[PDB]
Design a protein around this ligand. Structure first.
Ligand SMILES: CC(=O)NCCOP(=O)(O)OP(=O)(O)OC[C@H]1O[C@@H](n2cnc3c(=O)[nH]c(N)nc32)[C@H](O)[C@@H]1O
Ligand SMILES: [Mg+2]
Length: 170
């Protein structure tokens, strides 16, 4: 089978986790996606000449059982840590997702990319420099995206795969 990358999109409710994923897979922007739905999507793509499969979990926070959260974190190879540039709280929540994933996987080296979504909106509470400082402290890539205009969407997901590849080669 071709190589599969198991990706997990995390972040506060409403940041655009679903919108980003759907834009990547289905190439359209969704105005309204039920905030309570958590499904996974698969798509064959070509990244740097490699034909591969992206298996993407679009999370929705709480689970029936917390064991289910622990399961997807352990199974996940890479994580998109998404906040919205007009939601300071979502940016502050990133600390908690970072910590929780490393905790579950019991690892200090977990492939992650920081994603500042909704960058199409003029309304902004989180400056690019603030997110850059955070990503610097984590030693991960930071990318601003818009699920609406598709700006940066492929870059976020593909960078995360490249991060996973760097991790694996060790
Ligand atoms: C609790 C939990 O975590 N459950 C998942 C539900 O939350 P999530 O999936 O993170 O959020 P969900 O993709 O639905 O999106 C929220 C709103 O923002 C709009 N939106 C998304 N991306 C963009 C965007 O890039 N720009 C703009 N302008 N608006 C956007 C979008 O339509 C929608 O109304
Ligand atoms: Mg959603």
């Amino acid at each position: 089978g071709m190589t599969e990358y198991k990706l997990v999109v995390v972040g506060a409710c409403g940041v655009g986790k679903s919108a980003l994923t759907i834009q990547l897979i289905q190439n359209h922007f969704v105005d309204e996606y039920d905030p309570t739905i958590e499904d996974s999507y698969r798509k064959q793509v070509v990244i740097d000449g490699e034909t591969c499969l992206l298996d993407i979990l679009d999370t929705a926070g709480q689970e029936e059982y917390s064991a289910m959260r622990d399961q997807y974190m352990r199974t996940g190879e890479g994580f998109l840590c998404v906040f919205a540039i007009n939601n300071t709280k979502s940016f502050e929540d990133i600390h908690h997702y970072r910590e929780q994933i490393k905790r579950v996987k019991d690892s200090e080296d977990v492939p992650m990319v920081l994603v500042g979504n909704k960058c199409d909106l003029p309304s902004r509470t989180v400056d690019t420099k603030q997110a850059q400082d955070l990503a610097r402290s984590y030693g991960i890539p930071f990318i601003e995206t818009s699920a609406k205009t598709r700006q940066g969407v492929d870059d976020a997901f593909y960078t995360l795969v490249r991060e996973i590849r760097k991790h694996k080669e060790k």
